[PDB]
Design a protein around this ligand. Sequence first.
Ligand SMILES: O=C(O)[C@@](O)(COP(=O)(O)O)[C@H](O)[C@H](O)COP(=O)(O)O
Ligand SMILES: O=C(O)[C@@](O)(COP(=O)(O)O)[C@H](O)[C@H](O)COP(=O)(O)O
Ligand SMILES: [Mg+2]
Ligand SMILES: [Mg+2]
Ligand SMILES: [Mg+2]
Lengths: 455, 456, 160
Amino acid sequence: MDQSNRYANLNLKESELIAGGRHVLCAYIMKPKAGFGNFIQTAAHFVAESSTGTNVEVSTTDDFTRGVDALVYEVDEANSLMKIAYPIELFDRNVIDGRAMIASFLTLTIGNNQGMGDVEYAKMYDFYVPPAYLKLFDGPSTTIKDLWRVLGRPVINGGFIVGTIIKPKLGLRPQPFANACYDFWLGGDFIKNDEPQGNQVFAPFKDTVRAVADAMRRAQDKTGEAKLFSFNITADDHYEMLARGEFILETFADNADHIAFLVDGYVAGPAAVTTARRAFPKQYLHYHRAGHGAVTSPQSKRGYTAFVLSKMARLQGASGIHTGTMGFGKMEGEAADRAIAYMITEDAADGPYFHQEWLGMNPTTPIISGGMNALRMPGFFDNLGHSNLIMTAGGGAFGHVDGGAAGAKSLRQAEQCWKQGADPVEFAKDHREFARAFESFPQDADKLYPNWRAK
Amino acid sequence: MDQSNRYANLNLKESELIAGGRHVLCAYIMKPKAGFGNFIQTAAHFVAESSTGTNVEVSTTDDFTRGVDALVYEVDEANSLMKIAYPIELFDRNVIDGRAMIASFLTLTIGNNQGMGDVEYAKMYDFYVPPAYLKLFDGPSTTIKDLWRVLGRPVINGGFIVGTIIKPKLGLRPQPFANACYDFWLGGDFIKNDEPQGNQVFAPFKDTVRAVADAMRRAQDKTGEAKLFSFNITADDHYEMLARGEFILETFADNADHIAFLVDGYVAGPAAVTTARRAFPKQYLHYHRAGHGAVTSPQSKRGYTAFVLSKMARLQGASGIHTGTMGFGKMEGEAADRAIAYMITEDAADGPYFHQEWLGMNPTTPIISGGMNALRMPGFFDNLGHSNLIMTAGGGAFGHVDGGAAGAKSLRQAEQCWKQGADPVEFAKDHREFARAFESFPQDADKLYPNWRAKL
Amino acid sequence: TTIKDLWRVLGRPVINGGFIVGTIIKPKLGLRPQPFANACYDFWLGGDFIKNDEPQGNQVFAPFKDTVRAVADAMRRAQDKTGEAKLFSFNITADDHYEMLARGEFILETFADNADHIAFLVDGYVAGPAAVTTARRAFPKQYLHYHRAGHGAVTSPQSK
Ligand SMILES: O=C(O)[C@@](O)(COP(=O)(O)O)[C@H](O)[C@H](O)COP(=O)(O)O
Ligand SMILES: O=C(O)[C@@](O)(COP(=O)(O)O)[C@H](O)[C@H](O)COP(=O)(O)O
Ligand SMILES: [Mg+2]
Ligand SMILES: [Mg+2]
Ligand SMILES: [Mg+2]
């Protein structure tokens, strides 16, 4: 069925839809499946299944319904491009506080339309949210600013936070776990649970949390510097999340503001993210995106990009989200991913298709992680342009030949090298921990610094 | 780095791993990315990133850690197949009640491994959960049996529940919405919110719920039959979900057990599903899977299949989940998808790779939806083999030339046609609403029943 | 929450968004729900912001829920008439923590899509820090309006 006359209006001007401030805009790369309708016919059906319609005519439709129809307003078949305008009235709102929910945005813009038989594939690359809709989202309540304050750093451009992940990913018992925490903290700032760590039978939650709390006190007493930990509180059950968060804060007591809460936001879902954001607004919300690659990978032509994921996370209220290593680590990523960081940190930024004003909504920290080490950092910072961020290196830290403490210091010195604009190999001559990272990861050293051994 | 010596043990026997009952097994179709390690090397790194390891050696690893390593135990590079055994000790448990969480299963089995640079793609096609881990999941608390009971049907094989979705998807104001509900209920059993319907500014939640409650009373008074409604209570905020559910049940009062709760489980996530399952265990939990196609589509070689999604939903405690039309409707699906239905309904069933014993865990209803109408139903039932299910037809009902009530009856008569083993075109001669579905959807009629006009 | 969040609702710049024109509903007490709401509508035709006078709440002649409903209607009518956003600051002060919650929760549900136009007023000096914190922690996304009635007993330069 051809629904183009109803759901397509290519005469609409994007600048006017934006100026109007009554529409969410979404940009897709879509391709019709062979043996069905043409591009505009397919786009029209796509819009219907994403707003007010279905695959056939229904007598129950009235003019009020047609008034809130989503509309395809711009197409470019040669480039498989499709842009759709969603009246903001379509999106669900909370009965309890009249605020927006990302779940509704997802259901409409990237829901049932991902199962359409007449569509080969469709993926969202960008979206625009107008002020009237934007202001209804929670946004971040805690930012990197609050971590800088605890660390005793300037609250403006407080600089690089040296982080790690406790490795093994799973298998460490409570005290061996806490011992590794202490070791790293002698040289580093920040430690996060690896994403699956919680209440395993061999590492009970409360025992581990208590041991880590003791390690933090010991590390802070030894170094005279503040230390941070990000605990995984992810669960299916809302009340389990509350129980974990509540126990952690009571346990850390006077160090409670040194605690971040990690949530596996992609697999547990927006509901889990919001549980943490609304229950613990004064604790840094650390969004871990495990599983995201199933749709965000450039190998996938479905779902949405990492850029879209990141932008949504800022609205949901993540204090920080993993943005990837931008091609410099072990995970899939491109150097161009730097644009993701800018979109979540700045008050105004450009996406692949839409400019976004954030209207003073708090920033979300780009958390850099995935096969990073001291050697790979100078190149990463050069591409990004700043080090006002958290970087976690698990293997990069505990894989250091001289141990976790030395690993931490190598990360510290690596960023110091980049800020000083010094040559890494020349810099290494006066910085042992950094130099020993070459010996720790010789395969990496050979690639990045061909004749590092001679010098 | 080659981690095959640690994370691969192809000498392990699947029958023994299953017999042991200490391992979750997962089957993937994976392809290494060119310019990295071979198949077994790549599978080894995959296993490391999905259990206990990372991409390099760390001094903190001990022999206890190696003991809980996941292991690739079976490979077939020619068919891109990879099977991994996960010690159940790896999976997270609730502090509050010691029960399992699907979030941990996902984090490990299909989490970070979906972003690996040395892997071109990897997708889970099946998984096995042993008794020790299986018994820790909530499972469904309400089933179709509880809907049959309200309808006055037999609680065993109570039969086909005629359903629809209120269309337009969005745009109907509270009373026009309720009017459509009333009309359909004159001929049908079951109505669900279209998945995005909730508290839109033009259709406030409480006003719509009140109007629908009135429509249910009026329809039940008119027909003398019980009517069902499935309300969307999906939200980001746990407390919004509770507020919606609590208001609905108070409003419907003596009809409160006629209410199902719909949750957009894929986009809102397992956390939202569990909110409804644990807060409202005595209300039918209707899992709507909007967005799933982004990974479950056969066009995708990442994530997991719809089979995997459906099996997870039963563990999570869905009373019913959309399983698709199995190729007979408007959404992507194949006739072979019938196996999904069997996996969520039976106490024992076979997946593409693993046999599963459910140990008396309640079944999850196959909810059939997506471009269905009276004409397409006989063929669908032929492929599945039974009609003990809920089928919702939005366009199929309200797109009927004679309206929603006639639409409902055409669906009713279509299943009766299949049950009697009658010829649809011959059956139509004596059943007007069914016959009028041919005129309502002529393109479908021409394809499905050549020369129907001549015979009608 | 800060004035930035009010500026955002008014469509003003979120930095140095400028002057917010406000008033207090007078008589301090004595207006019944609809006469109260009528005064709100009238002011909102030219102004941005209205606060409860500090003692206004659930007086027997002006029941809380009836007044909140009437004011909510006035806000919609005023916003439709002027095409500009309007703000209200409601007194939710009480001895009982749970009364404060009940008032705040009812206001936000009633105002619905205008819920972010709502500020909560707390008579912080007489009800105390405990009352201020109840509102701050229970409703962090709503502008917290600290009314200092009674402060003059110590803050006055006449007092040493
Ligand atoms: O489990 C892991 O692999 C990590 O702890 C990194 O460990 P290593 O530092 O030892 O490699 C992080 O979770 C990934 O970076 C997640 O990827 P992303 O940030 O792209 O979401
Ligand atoms: O919005 C829709 O399209 C539907 O209400 C069907 O309406 P129609 O009857 O008018 O087609 C269902 O949500 C889809 O079937 C979901 O797909 P699935 O069941 O595959 O998850
Ligand atoms: Mg990790
Ligand atoms: Mg639907
Ligand atoms: Mg006053």
